Design a protein around this ligand. Structure first.
Ligand SMILES: O=C(O)c1cccc(OC(=O)c2cccc(O)c2)c1
Ligand SMILES: O=C(O)c1cccc(OC(=O)c2cccc(O)c2)c1
Ligand SMILES: [Zn+2]
Ligand SMILES: [Zn+2]
Lengths: 494, 495
C-alpha cells in the first residue's frame, strides 16, 4: 500500500488529550499511522523515512477537509432482511395511525422476548447467497457513513455471511452469533427454557474457530446474549466460562426498558445486572447496551466492575425507548467515571448513523444538565471512536490517530457555508452534517470510499443483489405476497 | 413566477389540517398560488380543467425521485452574523477542552444576559448600511438554502430596513421587527435601570411598520417583539399591547426561558414574566413565547386559557447550555394539553441547526421523554416547522401548508439515494439521515429560488465575499478586534 501524507486539514485524533490540530497532517506507511500533529512536525517525520519509502510517498491535499479517526460502531444489529415488513417498506405513507408498540410505552416484554426467540428459525430459513447480499449491503451502509470497525451484538443474518461481507468490503468486524435460550411466556409465571445452553455456546465456539483462521487482523468476535430476558442461569455461566477461557469481550442488552425489572423479577426472580453479576459477567469485559433502568446497587456493581455502557440516544425516540431522560442514569454514570460510548443499535432500513448519534449526545446530554461542556463535540467523537474501541477491546489497534495504531480515518469536506469561519469544523459537522457528508473512508491505509462513492465495490450492484435477496427472503420465508413486494421493487429509482 | 406548474410523481407532504400525505402525489400551481394538491391522477383532472391559454404554457416538473414539503416557516430567529468574529465563533481555539458554562448555561447569568441585550441598539448604530445589508443577505440566504421560505425576526443585531431589503432581494418571506429593550438588571444598584423611553421604542416599531407597508411584494410583514421580559418595563408591555391591538398584529418575546429567570424577575420586577405579560394583556392568541418552559401551574393555565403560542428550539438548547426541554417538561406537557407549539432555530452568529435539524431533534427528544414514538410523529414535526409556525406568526392565511389558495411555497428533496431506499415514508428517512443541505429545490410564490442545492436568483460567491468584507469592517472598526487576529482567519477561507 506504501506511504501517504494527508496534510492541511483540521485533524481530530481522539487521543488521551482529545488533541485537535488546525493545519494538521497524518503520515501513514502501509496499514499504520507513523506521525500525526502540526504539518511542520509531521513533515520532519517524512524527512526521517527510509528514502525508498519517501520516493513513492503519495500526498493528499486535505486543506479543504476535516480528518477524523474511523467510527467504531460497537453495538449494531444486521436486520435488513426485515426491511419489507410493517416496520419498513409495507407501511402506509401516512404515519397518523401509528401506535405505541414493541419497545414503546415502557416495553411489551412478552412480545420482545417472543420476537427474539424466533431469530434462530428465520436465520435458518435464509440461503447463504441471501445472507451475503443482505449483509454486504447493510455493512456497506455502515462503511459509507464512516464506520471502519463494526460490532455485531446479535443479527438476523448468518455469522459467516457477515464475516465474508466484512472481508470483501475491507472494513473491521467483531462477528457474533444469536443467543436466546429462554422466553417470557404469558401462559406461565416462570421463564420457559427454549434451547440447551450448550448448543447456543457451541454456535459461538464454531464462529470463533472460523474467525481464528483469518490472517487480515480485520475480523474478531465477541459473544452476546440477545437480552437478559432470554438468558437462563446456564447460558449466563456458560458465557462467563467461554469469555474467561478465550480472553474475549462480552455484550448484552440490560436495564434497557422501564418494564424490564418487573418482568425479570416475575420470570427469573432477579433483575438483569444482578443476574449478570451472579454469573461473574459484570466486569471490564461487559458492554451493556442502554443500561439506564438500574437501581442504586446495580449502578454500584457497574462502577466497581468498570463495565462499559453503549448508548444510542439517536434511536430512542423513534422506538419509544426512554433510556436517556426517564432515569438520567447513563449520563450520571459517565459523570461518575464509567466508560460510555455511542452506537446506532438495530435498523431494518437505514436509520441514524454514528455521525447522527454524536449530534444527539451533544444536544441531549448538555440540555439535561444545562451544561454545554458535559459532552463537548470532541467527547461525542471520543465516544464514537476511542471509548467505543475500548468497550469492544479493539483500542490496541483502532479508535484514535496515534503512532502505531491502524491508519483508519475519514475525510469530510469543510469548504461549504456550514463550515465557513468555524475553527471547530467538528462542531459545524454536529450542527449541520451527518453520515452522507463522509467523503473519504480509509481502513489500514486503503481508500474504500472517495467523494462519497465506493472505490473497489459497485454500490449499484450491492443494492441490486440486496433487493433480489430481500425479494426472495420476504416472499418465501416471511410469506409476504408478491403483490405487496414486486410493485415497491418496480418503483426503486435505478 | 407567473404561469402554471405541475410538480408530479413524488411523495407530497401537505401539512394541511389532516396532515395529508400523498404517495405519487402532485401540486398544480398557477402564478403565486397552489390551485390543486392530491393524487397525481386527481390533480391531472384540475390540469384538464384549466383555461386552455394557461394549460398551453404549463411547465411539468418530474418529481418522481423527490419528496415535496411545504416551505419551512422559521418564526423565531435572530440575525447575529455580525458577531461571528468573537469568542462565540471565529476567534475560538480549535480545541474545545477549555470551554466553560457561560451566558445562558448553568440556569443563566441573568445580569450578563440583560446587560448584553441592552447594548444591541449601540452596536447596530456602529454598523454601516452596506455592512447591515451584506451580513443580513448572507445570514438570510443560509436560512433560505435550508428550505426556510418564511423567516420571523424576534430581535436582531442588524438594521431592520437592511433585513427587509435582504428578504426583498432573496425572494423569501420575512416578518421584520425592531430591537426593544428599555430596562437592564443592575445588581450593583439593587434595581433595573430604565435605559430608554418605552414610547420611543414603540415609535421605532411604528416607523418600521410604515416602511414595510410601502413594500408591494406581499412577502414582507412585521411583528413587534420585546427582547426579553427582563428588559421590559410595565410601560413597554402596555404600549406593545396597545400597538398590536391598534394595528391587529402578532406579538413575540422570550419568557420562562431559563431556570434563574423567575428569581431575577421577582427581585427586579416583583413578578414572573408570563404574569407581567398577562397583566399588560399580552397573553392571548397573538403571543409567540420563545422557550416558555419555566412556567408554574398558573402561568401554564394563562397560556392555555389565552390560546397563546410557544416556539421551542430543541435543536440548539444543549450547545447553549439551556434546559428548556427536560428540566421542566412543560412545553411537551402544554402541547399535549392542546397549546400550539412550533419549532424554531433561534440565534446563531455562525451557521447552527436549521429547521430540518430541529425537526429531527423534536422527533427524537419529545418521543424519548414520554416513551412514545407517536407523541411527535414525523408529520407532526413537519407541521410544527410549517403550518403551526405560520399560525403562531399570523401568516397561516397564506403559508405553512400545500392547500388550494395558499402561496406556492415548497421544497423538493431528492429521495433516490441509500438513505430513502424502500421507505414509503421519505420524511422519516429525511429526519433520520438528512438535513438543511439536502434541500434541493426551494420555490416561493411559484418562483424557483434554489435548484440542485444552488441559488438561481443570487450570486452565492458574492453573498459570501460581501459578508466576509462587511464582517471584517464591522469587526475591526466597531468591535475593535485587531487586523492581526482577523486577517489570518480570512486568509484560510476556502474560495
Ligand atoms: O429491533 C430489532 O430488530 C432488534 C434486532 C436485534 C436486536 C435488538 O435489540 C435491541 O435493540 C434492544 C433489546 C432489548 C431492549 C432494548 O431497549 C433494545 C433489536
Ligand atoms: O445568543 C444570542 O446572540 C442572542 C441574540 C438575540 C436574542 C437572543 O435571545 C435568545 O435566544 C434568548 C433570550 C432569553 C433567554 C433565552 O434562553 C434565550 C440570543
Ligand atoms: Zn441493540
Ligand atoms: Zn430567541
Amino acid at each position: 500500500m506504501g506511504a501517504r501524507l494527508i496534510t492541511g486539514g483540521t485533524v481530530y485524533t481522539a487521543d488521551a488529550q482529545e488533541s485537535v490540530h488546525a493545519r494538521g497532517a497524518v503520515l501513514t506507511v502501509d496499514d499504520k499511522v507513523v506521525a500525526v500533529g502540526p504539518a511542520v512536525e509531521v513533515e520532519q517525520a517524512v524527512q526521517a523515512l527510509d528514502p525508498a519509502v519517501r520516493a513513492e510517498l503519495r500526498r493528499l491535499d486535505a486543506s479543504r477537509m476535516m480528518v477524523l479517526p474511523g467510527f467504531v460502531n460497537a453495538h449494531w444489529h444486521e436486520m435488513f432482511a426485515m426491511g419489507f415488513t410493517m416496520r419498513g417498506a409495507l407501511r402506509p405513507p401516512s404515519d397518523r395511525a401509528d401506535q405505541v408498540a414493541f419497545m414503546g410505552g415502557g416495553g411489551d416484554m412478552h412480545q420482545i422476548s417472543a420476537t427474539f426467540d424466533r431469530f434462530d428459525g428465520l436465520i435458518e430459513a435464509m440461503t447463504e447467497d441471501e445472507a451475503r447480499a443482505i449483509a454486504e449491503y447493510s455493512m456497506w451502509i455502515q462503511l459509507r457513513g464512516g464506520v471502519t470497525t463494526l460490532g455485531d451484538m446479535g443479527s438476523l443474518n448468518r455469522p459467516l455471511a457477515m464475516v465474508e461481507a466484512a472481508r470483501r468490503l475491507g472494513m473491521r468486524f467483531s462477528a457474533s452469533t444469536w443467543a436466546s435460550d429462554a422466553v417470557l411466556a404469558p401462559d406461565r409465571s416462570r421463564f420457559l427454557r427454549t434451547r440447551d445452553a450448550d448448543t447456543v455456546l457451541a454456535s459461538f465456539e464454531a464462529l470463533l474457530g472460523a474467525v481464528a483462521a483469518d490472517p487480515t487482523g480485520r475480523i474478531r468476535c465477541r459473544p452476546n446474549v440477545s437480552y437478559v430476558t432470554n438468558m437462563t442461569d446456564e447460558l449466563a455461566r456458560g458465557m462467563a466460562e467461554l469469555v474467561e477461557r478465550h480472553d474475549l469481550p462480552f455484550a448484552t442488552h440490560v436495564g434497557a426498558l422501564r418494564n424490564e425489572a418487573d418482568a425479570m423479577r416475575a420470570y427469573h426472580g432477579e433483575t438483569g445486572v444482578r443476574r449478570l453479576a451472579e454469573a461473574g459477567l459484570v466486569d471490564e469485559r461487559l458492554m451493556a447496551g442502554h443500561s439506564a433502568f438500574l437501581d442504586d446497587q446495580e449502578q454500584k456493581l457497574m462502577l466497581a466492575g468498570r463495565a462499559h455502557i453503549s448508548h444510542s440516544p439517536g434511536k430512542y425516540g423513534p422506538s419509544g425507548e426512554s433510556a436517556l431522560t426517564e432515569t438520567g442514569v447513563v449520563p450520571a454514570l459517565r459523570r461518575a467515571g464509567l466508560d460510555v460510548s455511542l452506537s446506532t443499535d438495530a435498523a431494518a432500513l437505514p436509520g441514524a448513523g454514528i455521525a447522527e448519534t454524536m449530534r444527539a449526545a451533544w444536544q441531549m446530554y448538555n440540555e439535561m444538565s444545562a451544561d454545554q461542556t458535559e459532552v463537548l463535540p470532541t467527547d461525542a467523537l471520543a465516544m464514537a471512536t476511542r471509548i467505543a474501541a475500548k468497550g469492544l477491546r479493539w483500542d490496541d489497534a483502532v479508535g484514535s490517530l496515534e503512532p502505531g495504531k491502524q491508519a483508519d480515518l475519514l475525510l469530510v469536506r469543510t469548504d461549504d457555508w456550514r463550515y465557513l469561519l468555524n475553527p471547530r469544523p467538528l462542531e459545524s459537522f454536529l450542527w449541520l452534517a451527518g453520515s452522507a457528508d463522509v467523503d473519504t473512508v480509509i481502513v489500514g491505509g486503503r481508500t474504500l470510499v472517495e467523494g462519497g462513492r465506493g472505490v473497489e465495490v459497485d454500490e449499484a450492484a450491492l443494492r441490486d443483489r440486496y433487493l433480489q435477496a430481500l425479494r426472495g427472503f420476504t416472499t418465501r420465508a416471511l410469506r409476504v405476497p408478491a403483490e405487496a413486494v414486486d410493485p415497491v421493487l418496480a418503483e426503486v429509482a435505478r
